[PDB]
């Protein structure tokens, strides 16, 4: 038709008028049958039985200091500056990881040597304010900074938590083969 105006084809659906709630006398069970559930706590014992079923099965719990939970290859933990095979630092002072960081953790000083190649005098990540987005891994064209999957590195001072170039080159030294394995397994999806 034409609708009234102030009004559309979104009428109330067929059956949205819900029925009157039935009284005591339009009930299917007897009052004695209802009182057996009332006094003998019929559904209390049901929920008691459920938690007793959970008592007799084998728990989900795992030992932390001797087992680590299931992890992905694309997981992210402490940083590392990689190197080339035949020993070369691989960060070409290209300044992309500093320009993308949503918390401004990177600070790089760049200087050029006689050779014409480019490296960094001072590389720096403040880990009080790195937020683990992995954009710094995504931006570097030469794949020089990564996220090693280590998380067990909690420290006791903040000055330990300021990572300079030397600490991150050490982290790229230690984690290398698992790092290369994770990047090679990640590499089709990037």
């Amino acid at each position: 038709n034409i609708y009234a105006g102030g009004s559309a084809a979104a009428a109330p659906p067929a059956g949205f008028r819900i029925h009157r709630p039935a009284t005591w006398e339009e009930s299917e069970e007897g009052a004695l049958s209802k009182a057996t559930k009332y006094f003998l706590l019929a559904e209390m014992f049901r929920g008691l039985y459920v938690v007793l079923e959970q008592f007799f099965r084998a728990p989900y719990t795992i030992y932390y200091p001797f087992e680590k939970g299931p992890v992905s290859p694309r997981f992210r933990g402490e940083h590392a500056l990689r190197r080339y095979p035949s020993g070369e630092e691989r960060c070409i002072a290209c300044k992309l990881c500093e320009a993308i960081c949503p918390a401004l953790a990177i600070t790089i000083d760049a200087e050029e040597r006689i050779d014409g190649s480019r490296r960094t005098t001072k590389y720096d990540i403040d880990m009080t304010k790195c937020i683990y987005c992995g954009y710094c891994q995504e931006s570097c064209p030469v794949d020089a900074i990564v996220e090693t999957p280590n998380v067990e590195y909690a420290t006791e001072t903040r000055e330990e938590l300021l990572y300079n170039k030397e600490k991150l080159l050490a982290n790229g030294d230690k984690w290398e083969l698992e790092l290369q394995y994770a990047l090679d397994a990640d590499a089709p999806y990037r």
Binding site: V50, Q54, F75, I100
Partner: protein
């Protein structure tokens, strides 16, 4: 004269003025976790403004990511592909499963039922594995970019999402069984927090609370995306 005494009832301060047991007026403070995330995103690009949205409302993080990466897409006049649409749909729905798995089993703890909180956590852990295998970190997946979705699924992930979806029906019916019929659960909650259908609107309420009161409205079916 009625004399009401005041008490200092995540992080939340809440003033209660009590005349005996009854609350006569209530006044929630808020702001002790205001950290200025609305002003900071004006100084960051959109690619950098994306993690400011799993910072807020952290329990259901992919949906909060999605609302910004939809407002941006509408303002861009671009179009996420088809695989992108199904992929973001199902991650938003396991995000819904996670948020209700926290919210239901935390209302159950605040009321007092202590088993579903523990049971819920184990189920949640399986979902945080589903996030952990897709983005890097658990609990802060930036995985829906504004242009689309950040990278492709793993090789054998869709099979494990099916393997979880088979058992989850039974493990949900189990936690449901001891709360839905329970007299203490039903008694403590049948007449509490009632909201009329006209005042569900004037208060600006939405979602499960506007749908509590009888009004059929949801943005998934009304204005879909």
């Amino acid at each position: 004269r009625i004399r009401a005494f005041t008490i200092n009832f995540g992080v939340l301060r809440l003033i209660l003025e009590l005349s005996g047991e009854e609350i006569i007026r209530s006044d929630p403070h808020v702001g002790l976790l205001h950290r200025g995330t609305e002003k900071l995103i004006e100084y960051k690009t959109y690619m950098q403004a994306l993690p400011y949205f799993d910072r807020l409302d952290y329990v259901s993080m992919m949906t909060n990511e999605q609302v910004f990466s939809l407002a941006v897409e509408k303002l861009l006049n671009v179009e996420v592909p088809l695989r992108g649409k199904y992929i973001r749909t199902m991650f938003g729905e396991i995000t819904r499963v996670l948020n209700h798995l926290m919210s239901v089993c935390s209302h159950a703890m605040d009321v007092g039922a202590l088993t579903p909180f523990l049971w819920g956590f184990e189920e949640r852990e399986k979902l945080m594995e589903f996030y952990e295998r897709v983005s890097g970190a658990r609990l802060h997946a930036a995985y829906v970019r504004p242009g689309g979705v950040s990278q492709d699924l793993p090789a054998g992930l869709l099979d494990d999402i099916y393997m979880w979806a088979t058992q989850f029906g039974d493990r949900l019916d189990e936690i449901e069984e001891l709360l839905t019929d329970n007299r203490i659960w039903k008694l403590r909650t049948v007449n509490i927090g009632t909201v009329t259908a006209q005042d569900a609107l004037n208060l600006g309420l939405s979602g499960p609370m506007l749908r509590g009161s009888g009004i059929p409205f949801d943005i998934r079916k009304n204005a879909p995306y």
